[PDB]
Write an enzyme that holds these catalytic residues in place. Sequence first.
Site, short mmCIF file in Angstrom:
data_model
loop_
_atom_site.label_atom_id
_atom_site.label_comp_id
_atom_site.label_asym_id
_atom_site.label_seq_id
_atom_site.Cartn_x
_atom_site.Cartn_y
_atom_site.Cartn_z
CD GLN H 11 -2.73 1.20 2.50
OE1 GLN H 11 -2.46 0.48 3.46
NE2 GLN H 11 -3.76 2.03 2.50
CD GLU H 71 -4.77 -3.33 1.39
OE1 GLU H 71 -5.71 -2.51 1.39
OE2 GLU H 71 -3.96 -3.44 2.34
CB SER H 140 6.61 0.02 4.05
OG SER H 140 6.68 -0.09 5.46
N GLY H 144 3.67 -7.26 5.98
CA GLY H 144 3.00 -7.89 4.86
C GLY H 144 3.72 -7.85 3.53
CB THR H 179 1.17 1.77 11.66
OG1 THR H 179 1.81 0.82 10.80
CG2 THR H 179 1.51 3.18 11.20
CG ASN H 228 3.08 8.75 -0.16
OD1 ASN H 228 3.85 8.45 0.75
ND2 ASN H 228 1.91 8.15 -0.33
CD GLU H 254 27.33 7.76 -8.67
OE1 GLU H 254 26.13 7.65 -8.35
OE2 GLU H 254 28.13 8.41 -7.99
N1 LIG Z 1 5.32 7.55 3.62
C1 LIG Z 1 4.25 6.76 3.53
N2 LIG Z 1 4.20 5.59 4.25
C2 LIG Z 1 3.12 4.78 4.17
C3 LIG Z 1 2.05 5.12 3.35
N3 LIG Z 1 1.12 4.15 3.45
C4 LIG Z 1 1.57 3.20 4.31
N4 LIG Z 1 2.80 3.59 4.77
C5 LIG Z 1 3.65 2.83 5.71
O1 LIG Z 1 3.27 1.47 5.67
C6 LIG Z 1 3.19 0.93 6.96
C7 LIG Z 1 2.00 -0.02 7.02
O2 LIG Z 1 2.28 -1.23 6.35
P1 LIG Z 1 2.06 -1.38 4.77
O3 LIG Z 1 3.33 -1.07 4.01
O4 LIG Z 1 0.94 -0.47 4.33
O5 LIG Z 1 1.61 -2.91 4.58
P2 LIG Z 1 1.41 -3.51 3.10
O6 LIG Z 1 2.67 -3.34 2.31
O7 LIG Z 1 0.23 -2.84 2.43
O8 LIG Z 1 1.10 -5.07 3.32
P3 LIG Z 1 -0.05 -5.55 4.34
O9 LIG Z 1 0.50 -5.57 5.74
O10 LIG Z 1 -0.52 -6.93 3.97
O11 LIG Z 1 -1.20 -4.58 4.26
C8 LIG Z 1 3.01 2.09 7.91
O12 LIG Z 1 3.85 1.94 9.03
C9 LIG Z 1 3.42 3.32 7.13
O13 LIG Z 1 4.62 3.85 7.66
C10 LIG Z 1 2.10 6.29 2.61
O14 LIG Z 1 1.16 6.60 1.89
N5 LIG Z 1 3.20 7.11 2.71
MG LIG Z 2 -1.84 -3.62 2.49
#
Ligand SMILES: Nc1nc2c(ncn2[C@@H]2O[C@H](COP(=O)(O)OP(=O)(O)OP(=O)(O)O)[C@@H](O)[C@H]2O)c(=O)[nH]1
Ligand SMILES: [Mg+2]
Lengths: 50, 49, 46, 51, 431, 50, 50, 437, 107, 54
Positions: H11, H71, H140, H144, H179, H228, H254
Site C-alpha cells: 500500500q 489487498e 515499506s 506484509g 503503526t 509521498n 553509480e
Molecule cells: N510515507 C508513507 N508511508 C506509508 C504510506 N502508506 C503506508 N505507509 C507505511 O506502511 C506501513 C503499514 O504497512 P504497509 O506497508 O501499508 O503494509 P502492506 O505493504 O500494504 O502489506 P499488508 O500488511 O498486507 O497490508 C506504515 O507503518 C506506514 O509507515 C504512505 O502513503 N506514505
Molecule cells: Mg496492504
Amino acid sequence: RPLPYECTLTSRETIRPRTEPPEVDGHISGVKHVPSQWDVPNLSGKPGAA
Amino acid sequence: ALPFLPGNSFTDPTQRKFHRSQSLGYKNGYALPARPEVGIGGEPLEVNQ
Amino acid sequence: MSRFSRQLPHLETFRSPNAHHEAFAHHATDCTARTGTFGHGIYESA
Amino acid sequence: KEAPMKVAQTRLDHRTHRPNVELCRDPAQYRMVQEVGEIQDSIDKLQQKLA
Amino acid sequence: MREIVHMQAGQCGNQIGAKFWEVISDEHGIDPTGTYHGDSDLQLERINVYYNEATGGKYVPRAVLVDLEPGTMDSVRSGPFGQIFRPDNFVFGQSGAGNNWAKGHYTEGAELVDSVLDVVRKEAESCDCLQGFQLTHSLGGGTGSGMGTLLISKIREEYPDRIMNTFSVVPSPKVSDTVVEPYNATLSVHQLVENTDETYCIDNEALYDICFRTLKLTTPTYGDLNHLVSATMSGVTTCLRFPGQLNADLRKLAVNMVPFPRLHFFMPGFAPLTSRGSQQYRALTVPELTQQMFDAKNMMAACDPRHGRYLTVAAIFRGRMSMKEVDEQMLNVQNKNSSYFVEWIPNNVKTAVCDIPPRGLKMSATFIGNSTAIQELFKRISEQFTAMFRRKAFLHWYTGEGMDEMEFTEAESNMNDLVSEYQQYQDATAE
Amino acid sequence: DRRFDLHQTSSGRGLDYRPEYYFPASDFKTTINNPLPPQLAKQDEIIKPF
Amino acid sequence: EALEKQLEHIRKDIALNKMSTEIRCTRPSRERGRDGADNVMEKEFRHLHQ
Amino acid sequence: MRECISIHVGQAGVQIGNACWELYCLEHGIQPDGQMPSDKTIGGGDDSFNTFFSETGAGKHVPRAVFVDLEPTVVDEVRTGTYRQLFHPEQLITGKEDAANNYARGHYTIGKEIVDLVLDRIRKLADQCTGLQGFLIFHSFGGGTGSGFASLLMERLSVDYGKKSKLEFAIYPAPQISTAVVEPYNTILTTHTTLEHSDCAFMVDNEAIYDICRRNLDIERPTYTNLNRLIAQIVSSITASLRFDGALNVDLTEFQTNLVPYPRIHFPLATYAPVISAEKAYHEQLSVAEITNACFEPANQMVKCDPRHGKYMACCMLYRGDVVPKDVNAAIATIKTKRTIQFVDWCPTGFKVGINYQPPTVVPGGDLAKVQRAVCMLSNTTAIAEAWARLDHKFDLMYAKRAFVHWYVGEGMEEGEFSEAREDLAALEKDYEEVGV
Amino acid sequence: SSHFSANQYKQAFDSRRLQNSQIPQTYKERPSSYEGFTQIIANDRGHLKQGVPRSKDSPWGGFVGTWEMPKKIPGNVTTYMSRGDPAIDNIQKTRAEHNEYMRQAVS
Amino acid sequence: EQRENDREEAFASDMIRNDKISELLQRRQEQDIRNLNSAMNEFRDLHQQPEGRR
Ligand SMILES: Nc1nc2c(ncn2[C@@H]2O[C@H](COP(=O)(O)OP(=O)(O)OP(=O)(O)O)[C@@H](O)[C@H]2O)c(=O)[nH]1
Ligand SMILES: [Mg+2]
Ligand SMILES: Nc1nc2c(ncn2[C@@H]2O[C@H](COP(=O)(O)OP(=O)(O)O)[C@@H](O)[C@H]2O)c(=O)[nH]1
C-alpha cells in the site's frame, strides 16, 4: 601605406561611392536618409521600457 | 557581438525546460545514431532543416 | 538478550588482526566523551 | 530575412480567424507586430548595404 | 601534411572535446553547417590536421566520441555545433560505467573497444601522414579512466611510433566529485605512465581560482572551464595550422620537454586572462604576457611551482611580435627566478611563435610546464589511496568484476616510484 | 467513464489533476539583447588580422 | 561537565602541537636536524596523550 | 534509452507510486490519458520521457511501472480515478487475500501466489526496455507485502536478472511512531533476506518528515499525500540526470559504487532541501551554500538518526536547478572544514556531486514553494546503527516471550529463521561498529 | 539449439543488445571440423542404441517452478572480499546447498 | 613606426570596446536575475497561497 595593414581608412559611416551611385530599391550609397532621432531608448524603468 | 574568448560567454537564464531527447539510441541489436530533429529544450534546431 | 550479544562481525576490514586489535584498543578508550552508541560521534561540546 | 516576414504575417492573419471571445490581444500579437517591424528594419539595412 | 586524430572519452571528455572542436571551428571559420566561411586562405590551407573534406566546402572533424552510455553525447549532438560531427563516429553502449574503473576497462569496456578500434582505424588509415592522437578524458570516472586507458594501450600497440597526448583532468585537492576517484586516478595513471607520450594534468580547483581571481566571473559554469582547456589545446597545436617565425609541433614539444620517458606530466596555462574591467588599466606587452604566463596562479594545475623546480617550460606565443623581445623575456624570467629551475639544464625553455593570434586578440600565449611540483598531486592521490586501501573500502566492487589486489599494489608502487623520481630530480645537483 | 466521488477518498482529493505551470509569464523580457549605447557600438578597428 | 571542558582544552592543545610541528617543518632544509626543542615537543605530545 | 522499471509493492509503495507518477506526468507534460496536449511536433516531439514512459505506435505514453498489492482496495482505487487510463491494467496486479502484516504470509503464502505473474509482467517490461538502467522498488519495512513479497521478489530478481541495479526505496519504522505491532518481526526478517539480494536501499521514514512538515512547511498536521509528495520529489531529483541535461550526470549504476563501502552496508539516508513554504521563502535568498548547510543540518534529515552520533562514509549531493559548480565547490569545502559534520578517517574523498540544470518542478496545489535550486542529500553514515540497535532491542523484547510467533510458524515459516535473522542483524550491528572505527 | 556465431556480427546478436536483461545461455561458438561418414547411431524410432553413452540428465530438461525453488537464496556475491572467514565458509555452504537442491530437482 | 603605433592603438581600443561591452552585458544579466527573482516572488504570492492547497 599611411595606415596599418589591419585597418581601413574608411569607417562604417564613411562608405561613399566615387562614381555615380546606382538606383537600388530607393537606397543610395552616400545618403543617410532620415537620421531618425526618435530611436533613443526609453531608460526610465517603466513597464514596457528598454 | 563579443569575440569568442573564454571570458566573453553568456547564457540565457530564462530557459525553463532543459530536456534531452534520446536521438542517440539502439534498435534490435544495433547502434543507430539517428538525425536530431530537436535540441535540448524542445525547440527545433536551426542548422540542417 | 545474551544469546545475541557474542557474535563476531560479518565483515573483516582491517587486513591483519594486529591492526584490528591495536585499533579497538584505544577505541574502547575513545568511546568515552562521545555521543550515542559505540562511540562513533563527535566529542559533544563544552 | 524574407522567410521570417512570411512567418510573422501568416501567423498574424491565421490568428485573426479566432472566434468571438478568443479574439484576444494576447502579449504575443504585440511581439509579433514588433517582429514584423524589426524584420522590415533589418531588410532596409541590408538593402542599404546592397546599394 | 600531418594529421591529429582526436578522441574524447567519458562525459567530461565528450563535453571538453566538443567545446574544443567548437573553438577551433569558429577559429578556422567553419560554420555550424560545416562549410568554410572564413576570410583568409590561411584558415583553409592547413585544415586537414583536424578536418576531412566531406562535401565540397564542407569539413567534418576527425573526432571519435566514446562512452559506455549515451549521456552527454546526446546533448552534444543536440547542442550548437553538434551536427558537424560524422554520425557514425559516435560509439556508445547502453550499460553504465558507475564511476568504476574496471567497468570502463575490463568487463563493460570490452564490448566497445573493438568498435572504437574499427572507427579509429578507419580514421587513421585515411590520413596520408598521421602524426598522433589526442585523448580528452577524466581520471576520476569509469569511462574516462578505464576505457580511456584501454584505448591508449591499444592505440600504442597498433601504432607504436605516434605522439600520444592526453589531457585527462585529474582529481581536485579539495572537494572530490567522486568518492572512488583515488582508486580511479591511481589505476588510470598506472597505465598513463607507461603508454602516453605526454599528459597535461588539469585541476578544476585551479580552473575555479583562474575564473575567480583573473576573470571575476561570478557565474563561471563549465563552459568557461572547457573554453580555457580548449584554448590551451589550440595553443599547443597552433604551429601545425598556421605559419610562424619559429614552429614547434607535438613531437618537437615532446622532445624538448621530457628529459626521461617517465616524466611527462605537464602544467598547462593560458595568457592573457583579464578581469572584466581591467583591460584599460593593463597595457599589452610581451613582458606582461610572459609574466602572466609564469605567474603561479595562471596554470590550470593546482600544485604550486614554488614547491618545486621547473624541469622544462614550453612557451608558444601567438601574435605579431619580436623574437628579440620573446628571447629577452625568457632569459629575464629564467635569470630572476633562478631558484625555480633545475641547475643542470640551461635554458629550460622551448619557444615557439605563431603568426595568427585568436580572433579578438593581439597576442596570446600558452605555457606548458614540466616541473617537480607534480609530486604534490601524486602524493595527494597516493595518500587518499592508502587511506582506504588499508581498510579495503570500495574495493569489493573491483574484486567483484574481477581484478586482483596485486594490480592495486603495482599501481600504488608505480605512483610511488614516479614520486621518487620527481623528488630525485628536484634535489639532484650538477656538481 | 469517470468517477464522481473522489472527494471522499484521500488519494482522489490529493491526486486530482490540474495542468502544469510555466514559470515566466508572457510579459517577461530580457534586457541583455537591447542595442548597445553608441559609445560601445563602434566599428571593429581591426579588419584583416591574418 | 568541568572534566569534559578540560578534555576539550587538552584536545585543543593537541591540535596546537600538531600545527606547531607543521610550521616547524615549514623551515628551510639547511637548519632542520634534531633539536632539544623538538625533543621537548615530542615529550609534550606524550604528556598530553597520557 | 535510459529505461528504468518501477516496482511499487504494498500500500505504501502504491501510494508513493501515485504521487511519483503524478510528478512524472507533470514533468514530461503528460495528461492523465497518456497523450501529449499538443500534436506530435509542437509542445513536445522530444524523447526525454522514455526513461519512464514507453510510446505505442499512436503516441500514447504508458508508464514503466508494476503496481503490486495483495489487498484489492488501494489498487482498485488507482484503477478507478484520475489516472485510470494512464496506468496499464495488466501492470496493476492485485490479489484477493492480503498478507495482513505478516512477512511469512508475504514470503511463502499469498506473496508466493503472485510472484510468477509479477515476474512475467517485469520481463515483458524489460523486453520493452532497450538499455534498462535498473529497478526502483518502492516498499515499506512495515508489514506484509512490503516485507515478504518485496524480499521474495528481489530474491527472484537477483536469481534471474544477474547483477542489475535493484535500488530500494524503503519506508523504515520510526523510533517512536509505528503503526503495526509485528513490525520489528517483519523488519528483522526482511532485512535478513534483503541484505544479500540488494545493491542500495534509500531509507526514508515517516516521523522525520512529519517533523519537517511541522517545522519547515508549517502544515502542523500533514498526511500520507504530503509524505509521498516529498518522497516523489526525492526520487525525481535522483532520476533527473537520466532525463535532463546537466553539467554532471549521475546514472543508477553509480549509486551502489559510490555509496556502498562494504557488503551488507547499503542503507543510506535521504534529505531534500530546501523543503519550505512560500511565505517563508519570500524572506530568503536561497543559494548553494545555504541549501548545502540545510542538507547537512541534523533537522532536515528524513530519517530520525542525527549524524552527530556517527561518522559519514559516502555523501551523494545531487544539485538540481540553476546551480553553479563554483559555489558547489565552495559549499562542500566549507562543509569539510565544518567540525560538527564528521567523516570517517579512511575516506578522504567522501563526496560525489551530480549537477542537473532542470529547475525543481512544482505540483499545482502542492506544499513546496517553487525554488530555483535544490539538493538531494544521500548519506551513508554509521548513525543508522542506533536505529538498528533500537529495532533489535524491540525484536528481543518481543522475542524473549516469543509473542506473535505462532502466526508465522502456523502458516508456514520455520522458527529458526527468527534466530538466524537476529544473528544476521547482530552481525550487521557489529559490522557498523567495526566500520565506525 | 545452435547459436553458432556470426564472426563480424558477434558484437551484435548479444542478449544485452537485444533487450534481454536476463543472464544468457552459452551455446558452443566457433564450429569444429569432422572427417566424414558419421555413424547413424540410431533407428527409425527415436531410440538411442545399445552401448551409446547416454546422458544422465533429465529427458524433460532442467527447469524448476516457483513451488520447488529453495527457501533461501545465497545472492550471487562472486567476490569473497572484505568478509570474515566464517562468512566465506557459510557463503560456500549456502552455495553448495543451492547447487545440490537444483541438481536434485532437475534429476 | 607610426604604422606600428596605430596598429597597437587599434588593437587596444578594440579590446576596450570588447570588455566594456562584456561588463555592460554582465550588469544586464544581473538585472535579469533580479527581475527573475521578483517575478518568482510574484508567482509564489499568486499561485502558492495555502488556501489553494489540496
Ligand atoms: N510515507 C508513507 N508511508 C506509508 C504510506 N502508506 C503506508 N505507509 C507505511 O506502511 C506501513 C503499514 O504497512 P504497509 O506497508 O501499508 O503494509 P502492506 O505493504 O500494504 O502489506 P499488508 O500488511 O498486507 O497490508 C506504515 O507503518 C506506514 O509507515 C504512505 O502513503 N506514505
Ligand atoms: Mg496492504
Ligand atoms: N572541466 C570540466 N570538468 C568536468 C566536466 N564534466 C565533468 N568533469 C569532471 O569529471 C569528473 C567526473 O568524471 P566523469 O567524466 O563523470 O567520468 P565518467 O562517468 O566515466 O564519464 C569530475 O571530477 C568533474 O570535475 C566539464 O564539463 N568540465
